[PDB]
Amino acid sequence: IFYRLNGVGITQQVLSENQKLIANKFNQALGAMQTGFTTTNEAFQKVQD
Amino acid sequence: FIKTNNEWSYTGSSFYAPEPITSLNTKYVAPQVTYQNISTNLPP
Amino acid sequence: FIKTNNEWSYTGSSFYAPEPITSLNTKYVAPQVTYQNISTNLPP
Ligand SMILES: *[C@@H]1O[C@H](CO)[C@@H](O[C@@H]2O[C@H](CO)[C@@H](O)[C@H](O)[C@H]2NC(C)=O)[C@H](O)[C@H]1NC(C)=O
Ligand SMILES: *[C@@H]1O[C@H](CO)[C@@H](O[C@@H]2O[C@H](CO)[C@@H](O)[C@H](O)[C@H]2NC(C)=O)[C@H](O)[C@H]1NC(C)=O
């Protein structure tokens, strides 16, 4: 993830300094989708029909 | 960058081809904590 | 790298624009057998 965010154009200073918040952001991003398992997920709509 | 049993060396991305490290195949990057500090056999 | 008729020079890859060689349009590279060994007018 460090090298991929290097690849998008983010400097190594903030990656060296801001690991915890981006880790929490990624973790809560992957945790929010479990409760989103409903009609709002267009992927479930496509699977369903 | 690579180690071998005959100090580091270089290999390409698609073949195990050991050869001594040059500036023609490396670039300068700001330091990161994950790296390896060396103080005995400095490459050119 | 393009010969001139008023000696090598630089040209772009999509237009015939002869231009003297600088450091900003070339890169260092390992030698090959097919390269030209010029020894009377060294490029900068
Ligand atoms: C190589 O030396 C550098 C310089 O001291 C080390 O970088 C620091 O390492 C400490 C802990 O090892 C960290 O708390 C600092 O944040 C690091 N600073 C920077 C600017 O990177 C590096 O860890 C050393 N590497 C090895 C393998 O010993
Ligand atoms: C320019 O000089 C180089 C150095 O001798 C020539 O490259 C060598 O060419 C011989 C001829 O087959 C090869 O056996 C060597 O392996 C080559 N050396 C390297 C390092 O590749 C090159 O041929 C010369 N250029 C011209 C146009 O004659």
Side-chain angles (χ1 to χ4, degrees):
Chain A
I1 299 304
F2 264 106
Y3 274 100
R4 285 210 201 192
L5 270 296
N6 191 4
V8 75
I10 308 298
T11 185
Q12 293 82 17
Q13 188 273 331
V14 62
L15 276 296
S16 311
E17 203 53 48
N18 199 1
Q19 297 91 323
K20 299 288 96 176
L21 194 79
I22 68 166
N24 295 2
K25 277 178 186 180
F26 188 69
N27 209 0
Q28 73 96 31
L30 276 296
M33 51 95 78
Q34 281 74 12
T35 76
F37 276 10
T38 175
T39 317
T40 71
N41 285 359
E42 214 54 51
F44 283 172
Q45 287 325 109
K46 290 224 271 197
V47 164
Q48 215 57 66
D49 54 346
Chain B
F1 302 151
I2 209 64
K3 282 289 288 185
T4 180
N5 271 306
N6 299 350
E7 176 61 83
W8 294 66
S9 42
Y10 172 83
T11 187
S13 285
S14 303
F15 189 79
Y16 184 15
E19 66 94 23
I21 181 63
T22 78
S23 82
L24 323 170
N25 59 6
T26 193
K27 79 171 72 68
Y28 300 111
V29 174
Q32 281 180 43
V33 72
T34 78
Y35 275 127
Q36 278 79 359
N37 299 322
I38 177 64
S39 161
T40 300
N41 275 319
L42 277 79
Chain C
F1 284 120
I2 177 62
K3 298 305 286 187
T4 195
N5 213 4
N6 321 303
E7 169 58 42
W8 286 271
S9 64
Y10 179 78
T11 183
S13 276
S14 162
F15 182 82
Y16 183 68
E19 193 273 329
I21 192 66
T22 69
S23 71
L24 317 176
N25 46 2
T26 187
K27 61 191 182 75
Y28 300 92
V29 66
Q32 290 188 231
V33 69
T34 78
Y35 290 158
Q36 277 74 10
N37 301 332
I38 175 65
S39 179
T40 174
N41 276 319
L42 311 182

